[PDB]
Amino acid sequence: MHIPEGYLSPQTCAVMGAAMVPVLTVAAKKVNKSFDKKDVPAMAIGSAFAFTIMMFNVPIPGGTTAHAIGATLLATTLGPWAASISLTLALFIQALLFGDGGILALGANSFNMAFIAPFVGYGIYRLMLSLKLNKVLSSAIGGYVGINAAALATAIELGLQPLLFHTANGTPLYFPYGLNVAIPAMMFAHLTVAGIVEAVITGLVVYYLLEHHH
Ligand code: NI
Contact 7, 155 (CB under 8 A): no
How is the chain split among helix, strand and coil, in percent rounded to 5? 75, 5, 25
Cβ neighbours for 98, distance < 8 A, ≥ 6 positions apart: none
Report the structure determination method.
X-ray
Q: How far is the centre of ligand 1, averaged over its atoms, from the C-alpha of 57 (Å)? A: 8
* CATH number reported for the structural domain that contains residue 174 in this entry: 1.10.1760.20
CB 153 within 8 A of CB 182: no
Quoted resolution (Å): 1.8
**What is d(CA 151, CA 147) in angstroms, rounded to the nearest whole number?**
6
**How far apart are the C-alpha atoms of 35 and 32, rounded to whole Å?**
6
Give the single-character DSSP code of 59: E
Type and span of the H or E element at 114: none
The Cα 71–Cα 76 span in angstroms is 9
**Cα dist. 174→86, 91, 99, 106, 168 in Å?**
29, 21, 18, 16, 14
User: Residue 23: CB partners within 8 Å, gap ≥ 6?
Assistant: 84, 111, 115
**Cα 157 to middle of ligand 1, angstroms:** 14
CA of 64 to the centre of ligand 1 (A): 7
Spacing, Cα 54 to ligand 1 middle (Å): 7
Residue 109 alpha carbon to ligand 1 centre in Å: 8
> Beta-strand (E) ranges in 152-191?
none
The DSSP-derived string for 64-109 is -EE----HHHHHHHH-HHHHHHHHHHHHHHHHHHH--S-STTHHHH
Tell me how far the alpha carbon of residue 66 lies from the centroid of ligand 1, in angstroms: 6
Determine the structural domain holding residue 189 and report its residue range. 1-214
Number of structural domains found in the chain = 1
Cα–Cα distance for residue pair 188/148, rounded to 1 Å? 10
Q: Tell me how far apart the alpha carbons of residues 122 and 6 are, in angstroms, rounded to a whole number.
A: 31
Tally of helices (H runs) and strands (E runs) in the chain: 9, 2
